Design a binder for this molecule. Structure first.
Ligand code: HEM
Ligand SMILES: [Fe+3]
Ligand SMILES: [Fe+3]
Ligand SMILES: [Fe+3]
Ligand SMILES: [Fe+3]
Ligand SMILES: [Fe+3]
Ligand SMILES: [Fe+3]
Lengths: 157, 158, 154, 158, 158, 158, 153
């Protein structure tokens, strides 16, 4: 059993995670196509992590006797340049983190503490493994220079 | 070492029988794999490899006796539509093989030709223990477990 | 068939020209100190020679005479961007020839050589992608940064 | 590069198909694990990963053709309320995908795009053998075995 | 995935060709072993195993297409008296197999089913390189080395 | 375990035959080593050791049946002059040994002495496969390879 | 510049030798002569490594290697013909290499000279191998030589 509000919040977060997975997929493939291999490996690992997070969320929704809507997918912001991709990923992650904070508050209110623990784990991942790394990447594109950052992202020839 | 015409003829009959058996087990194993009965498929593939070894032994014996192995001839095939039908068809073919092998062993003993008799006795041993025993056990297990439980056992991992 | 053998000989000539061009470009990349780009060009050369080995064996197995005498015009670049551009252009010509030859081999119902040429075309398209990406990386990250990456370890 | 508009569009269609399949098998594997059917959930999850890899290959090819990978669109999922319905829906989706794949292969041959055709042939082989065959054999097993026996086999170790 | 009746018939013709090839290779290998040509017996026995694998792949494809695979049909064998005659017969039958394979591949291209075309192209590659090429090489070797020297090489270690 | 005196007599005849075979094979192996034919030397030395093993089997059986072995008596040695004559002589002696063995096996069957029949069938198999088969193969290889090529193979490394 | 031109001519011959040796090895493997085909494959590979060294040497001299040109390929229809064609090409190699080494010694250029001297050592070794192969063909008969060149069946 699981409350309606909690299940709806979980479904919202799941839609978010699936959209982010698709975006990370697209961006990793474009980054590999462009020749940036380090950035591509990072983004692919991130997409795999997103898939794992979505898996955890779906398992949670199914345990709570709900219906995980995977048919839906939010608006997808694709980048044309590497800085654009980085900024778009960061924006998506920020929105996701906001929604996650809201969902954690809702799960606390509805006294669903296991779900809240899962969501807290997800928020930790989305704040450290993702948002931090992308903010760092934007800062490095600013400080290293676009050319130097793209050289670093290309890895080895 | 010239071979007697009768021993050559009975060896050729047994060779035709074993080659027809090899084809039958090959078809049965392949459609069992098609149906997902992987355990039965693996066992029947092993049995068809043993049948190939039997045909090889028979051909070696025929060639040693300066005979011409009639390998182009193939007996009638009985192909089942479901697992019990394959088990019954294989059992019937194996009883026919046992009868023919027993007659050939009798002829080999009557005709002084003892090495072929030993080869055929080995073939009869493997036929009744590896094949006929397994198929009789299989029919009994289909009867006792029931069709559904037996088919679950045959399917194995899904 | 005569037309299939002639097309195979043409593809073999393209491959031999590519072998010579790639090995020369690798050697001058190593001469300039571009160790990593030189190693990649050397590997690309070796793969083209393995492809030419496969094509020669195919021509012989078709009871034909391989023409290792002919060679196309070697486009030799004065600098690394020109090397990459020349390699890409030669791959363009080779890919067009490969597509036409695969169509011809399909028409004559000669499928083993068609499959071998499909393998060749897959590798050629991968090489297209690599060289186009290298040129785009040059444009994106600057010639100096690309040359530093090509050097790798000093 | 400079892929044909028709080829790129067909590839995008195949991609939408692959992504929808990925989502569907994801959902199905999760609720199969939820129901306790672990020996089936593992297979479904492996197939979902395979789908992910296939879609990756497709996107890489579309990008190599200077096209825009439509990873946004998604078809209408068909989620089963029971394992038989699950497997039937999976089989149906895979059959539709195979039809679309055959059409795309024909288009790639007609437009002399042989590398994309090779990729699509690989995908079609994987979908016909690794997926469609398994789903068909599962639908047959959950009928030869009975629903109860099949679900016992699908649950694996309790 | 139901297949075309024409594709099933052509695959059955290919299957009977491969079974006949395996049978003829069996007889030839065993005769070579009887004469003491050890290395030739090894090679021809391995070719027989490859032909059994080819027949298995063909029958799996036929069963996958829901067509009954005919293995009772066997084509007329061409057994050679001596080694050059045997290898000439093997080369001729392999050429006929190649022609039938090319016709089947063209049919599979026409009938829009491409997994069968893939397996048949694999079979054609194996027939052309693993079997046809070795046989023409050996015929040329009989011509060049001479019969006595070629048989000395084929006998190997006495 | 005193047996039938006729069984002891035929066992003594067989033991004398094996001892003479061992003597002839010893002389032939040493002659082949003397002429420089190392491959044939090794094979014939192993065959001489096998004849010694068969003599051991026969003498153990004779002593078990409370019989006095006839080891002093020997048959005439058919010693060859060149390699083809030596091989033909070995083959002829082995064929005669096979005939004697078949007669003894028949006598052992007639006297209900089944363990001696078992050892005699073992000896007959080793004589008809490890000895007679190889000797007829060698004669055929002399005919096919020619004498010069066969002797080159026999000499081996020089 | 004369040393560079001589090195380019040596490189052209070495490229022709690569092509001829490889095509001969592939033909020998097509006919079933596995031992001879393997030896000729190894010889082609050694000549590829030699051409690699000579291209390195030419580029070190700030010259432009001429990989476009190629000498005539003497392609044989049967094994003895390809043996003698290899031998004749190697004889031309030896004459050209000796002239090149004398030129390099005259021009006070010594590193390309020791490279050409080792090249001449392998070339003379190959010349001996092919002359010995022809004499062996004559000695044992073409049938026996082809049986040996086949190796294992
Ligand atoms: C024309 C100038 C050529 C040069 C400078 C050259 C150079 C080389 C080098 C340095 C190697 C490395 C061998 C090793 O390290 O073991 C090699 C190997 C090889 N070459 Fe050449 N080569 C040339 C032409 C060719 C041609 C025309 C062919 C075939 C048509 C060919 C076929 C091969 C093959 C098959 C290998 C072995 C590849 C391997 O072992 O991975 N080469 N070559
Ligand atoms: Fe059997
Ligand atoms: Fe930098
Ligand atoms: Fe049960
Ligand atoms: Fe075959
Ligand atoms: Fe004995
Ligand atoms: Fe010889």
């Amino acid at each position: 059993x699981x409350x309606x509000x909690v299940x709806x919040x979980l479904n919202x977060x799941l839609x978010x995670x699936l959209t982010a997975x698709x975006q990370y997929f697209x961006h990793a493939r474009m980054x590999x196509n462009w020749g940036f291999x380090x950035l591509x490996x990072x983004x692919x690992x991130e997409x795999x992590x997103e898939x794992x997070x979505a898996x955890x969320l779906i398992x949670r929704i199914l345990x709570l006797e709900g219906x995980p809507x995977x048919x839906x997918x939010x608006x997808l912001x694709i980048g044309x340049x590497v800085p654009x991709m980085x900024x778009n990923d960061x924006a998506x992650e920020x929105x996701x983190x906001x929604x996650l904070x809201x969902x954690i508050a809702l799960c606390e209110x509805x006294x669903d503490y296991x779900x809240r623990x899962x969501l807290x784990x997800x928020l930790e991942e989305x704040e450290x493994x993702x948002x931090x790394x992308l903010x760092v990447x934007x800062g490095x594109x600013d400080x290293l220079x676009x050319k130097n950052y793209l050289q670093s992202x290309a890895x080895x020839x | 070492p010239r071979g007697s015409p009768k021993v050559i003829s009975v060896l050729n009959g047994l060779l035709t029988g074993e080659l027809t058996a090899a084809d039958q087990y090959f078809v049965h194993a392949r459609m069992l794999e098609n149906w997902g009965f992987k355990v039965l498929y693996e066992r029947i593939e092993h049995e068809r490899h043993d049948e190939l070894d039997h045909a090889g032994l028979l051909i070696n014996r025929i060639l040693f006796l300066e005979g011409v192995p009639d390998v182009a001839s193939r007996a009638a095939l009985n192909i089942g539509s479901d697992v019990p039908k394959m088990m019954a068809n294989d059992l019937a073919y194996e009883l026919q093989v046992v009868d023919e092998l027993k007659a050939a062993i009798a002829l080999c003993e009557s005709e002084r030709d003892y090495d072929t008799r030993r080869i055929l006795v080995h073939l009869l041993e493997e036929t009744e223990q590896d094949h006929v025993r397994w198929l009789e056990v299989q029919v009994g297990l289909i009867d006792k477990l029931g069709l559904k439980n037996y088919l679950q056992s045959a399917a194995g991992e899904i | 068939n005569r037309t299939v053998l002639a097309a195979l000989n043409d593809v073999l000539r393209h491959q031999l020209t590519a072998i010579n061009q790639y090995f020369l470009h690798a050697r001058m990349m190593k001469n300039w100190g571009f160790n990593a780009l030189g190693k990649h060009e050397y590997k690309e050369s070796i793969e083209e020679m393995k492809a030419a080995d496969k094509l020669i064996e195919r021509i012989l197995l078709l009871e034909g005479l391989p023409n290792l005498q002919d060679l196309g015009k070697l486009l030799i670049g004065e600098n690394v961007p020109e090397m990459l551009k020349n390699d890409f252009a030669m791959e363009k010509d080779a890919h067009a020839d490969l597509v036409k030859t695969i169509a011809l081999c399909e028409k004559q119902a000669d499928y083993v050589s068609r499959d071998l040429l499909s393998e060749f075309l897959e590798e050629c398209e991968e090489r297209m992608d690599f060289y186009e990406t290298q040129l785009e990386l040059v444009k994106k990250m600057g010639e100096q940064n690309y040359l530093q990456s090509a050097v790798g370890a000093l």
